Write a protein that binds this ligand. Structure first.
Ligand SMILES: *[C@](O)(C(=O)NC)[C@H](CCC(C)(F)F)NC(=O)[C@@H]1[C@H]2CCC[C@H]2CN1C(=O)[C@@H](NC(=O)OC)C(C)(C)C
Ligand SMILES: *[C@](O)(C(=O)NC)[C@H](CCC(C)(F)F)NC(=O)[C@@H]1[C@H]2CCC[C@H]2CN1C(=O)[C@@H](NC(=O)OC)C(C)(C)C
Lengths: 302, 302
């Protein structure tokens, strides 16, 4: 029993973190096979950041302008190219610690683990979700650019996020491992703000199932609701629409607990309208939305 | 910016996890140098668990009764001994992935990362605290025994917890890596209950400093309090006493934010008496107590 915000073991990713320096900018890179992936803004100076033309800035660089360090050893850069907002540095050595990996671009609502790094050294691991407004609520300081987010599927590391920036509200923006930003953000130091965020409804329902699996049932009720009437209440509280596909994905949890999805929706509706009345669910006084249905099944079934 | 429940990168510990089987009981072991450490209850049967005499049960075992598997390879057991509630199995191979390590017995209020494992395979990592009642609020299923808790200090892994059991309230009990239980618990399937828990006051204050460092200041006030008057209010809310040593440990955070410890105590007193009035601190509607002052400095300073 128990339910924690649980990250994937980070070992397979720790064995891929390197330091990348270009001029006075040092950040992290991801070394897989003979390629090091990092944010392309590693080529910028403070003046360039305001409005950079990355194609020009990269044309002015050579392989020797990039210093890649894997622990105590230097990896010679033998080639370079830009793919969207990432820079790919071909190196002379294939990483012997390269795990089985994939690059995936996730959807909002999906969770992942972040391995926060500084100077190519892993510092900590935590669990995030891609918010509906395409930001992540991470914990990143200057030097963390190039830190990655990932999921582990059996023995395959699926990389889904690379860190690039912090928005004025303290939330974070970045790209997939092919350098495409999540959301409308751009890698330039200019006025950008996250849109209004919403609650990931399917994940709140998944976490209410986790609470039931763990013996927290106080919020359950005899009522059911229709998907339409639930969505009418959900919109009012800035919750994402619950779809029939979401109801289907919650099927296994619904069957394991004997509580139909629309029955759980009536509990969520009652919680949204009345609050918790001084009570907690899984040690939280707020409705948690950063566990997917898969995270709940994984953690509760091992 | 940002503040998350952050675990240490688990790689160094993942490289030490093995599976240990004795009869039909399979659990996890920790392989460091040529020794595998695991819960001694691996030698018990369901009938033995009610009231075992471990000295007898171990005398009846031989090295060949223990099956140690490190991934796909079998590690031959060449010796065995019991130290408190842990079993130490000497094996024919020294772990080539043995990090720089120490075994430490932590105090209540200290935090650590748990690498949850099943059949010698790491499943997830999360952050815990040793509660004042000597339990941990973990997330563990059957098969997780032998999973360890640790801190990483520079390049040294300090192991502090090995998982053994779950109490009726859903919280967890275990030992240090030398097999001494935290708290009054014993490794036998009999009536045991955790005592009433309290809030780790020094950690709540550390997290209020983390909130200020991250721009959350709504709870601050112009008042100060005395250590005695704060402790009089703290006892009323089941909070641990705040000591002068705690006030000293919070010194660096107090100096970085310009808010004296007793000034922050007046904020905590006001929060305990009035509540949050619909507001949150670092995304929480409860006062968090599972970040130590060191965790805050580490995460906020990188
Ligand atoms: C990152 O480049 C790094 O770690 N380099 C050593 C750095 C990470 C900062 C933080 C707080 F998120 F960890 N990112 C930046 O400084 C980025 C940089 C690349 C893309 C634009 C350029 C500015 N920038 C920012 O994060 C700025 N934010 C915005 O411009 O938001 C619209 C600030 C420096 C935070 C104002
Ligand atoms: C652990 O032995 C294991 O993973 N083995 C394969 C197991 C872990 C259970 C859990 C839920 F915490 F992950 N631990 C036990 O089953 C222990 C076992 C060793 C010490 C006593 C004996 C019973 N036990 C318990 O956890 C029981 N709890 C108590 O007896 O609490 C007083 C239950 C089986 C949970 C009732």
């Amino acid at each position: 029993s128990g339910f924690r915000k649980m990250a994937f073991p980070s070992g397979k990713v720790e064995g891929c973190m390197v330091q990348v320096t270009c001029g006075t900018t040092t950040l992290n890179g991801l070394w897989l096979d003979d390629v090091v992936y990092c944010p392309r803004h590693v080529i910028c100076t403070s003046e360039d950041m305001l409005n950079p033309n990355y194609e020009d800035l990269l044309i002015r660089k050579s392989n020797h302008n990039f210093l890649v360090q894997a622990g105590n050893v230097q990896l010679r850069v033998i080639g370079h190219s830009m793919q969207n907002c990432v820079l790919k540095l071909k190196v002379d050595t294939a990483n012997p610690k390269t795990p089985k990996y994939k690059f995936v671009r996730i959807q909002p609502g999906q969770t992942f683990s972040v391995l926060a790094c500084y100077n190519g050294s892993p510092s900590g691991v935590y669990q995030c979700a891609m918010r509906p407004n395409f930001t992540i609520k991470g914990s990143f300081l200057n030097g963390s650019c190039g830190s990655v987010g990932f999921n582990i599927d059996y023995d395959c590391v699926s990389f889904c996020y690379m860190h690039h920036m912090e928005l004025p509200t303290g939330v974070h923006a970045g790209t997939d491992l092919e350098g495409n930003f999540y959301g409308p953000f751009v890698d330039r130091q200019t006025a950008q703000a996250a849109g209004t965020d919403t609650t990931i409804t399917v994940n709140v329902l998944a976490w209410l199932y986790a609470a039931v699996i763990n013996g927290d049932r106080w919020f359950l009720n005899r009522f059911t609701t229709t998907l339409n009437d639930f969505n009418l209440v959900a919109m009012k509280y800035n919750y994402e629409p619950l779809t029939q596909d979401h109801v289907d994905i919650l099927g296994p949890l619904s069957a394991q607990t004997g509580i139909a999805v629309l029955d759980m929706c009536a509990s969520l509706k009652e919680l949204l309208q009345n609050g918790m009345n001084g009570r907690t669910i899984l040690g939280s006084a707020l409705l948690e939305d950063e566990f997917t249905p898969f995270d709940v099944v994984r953690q509760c079934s091992g």
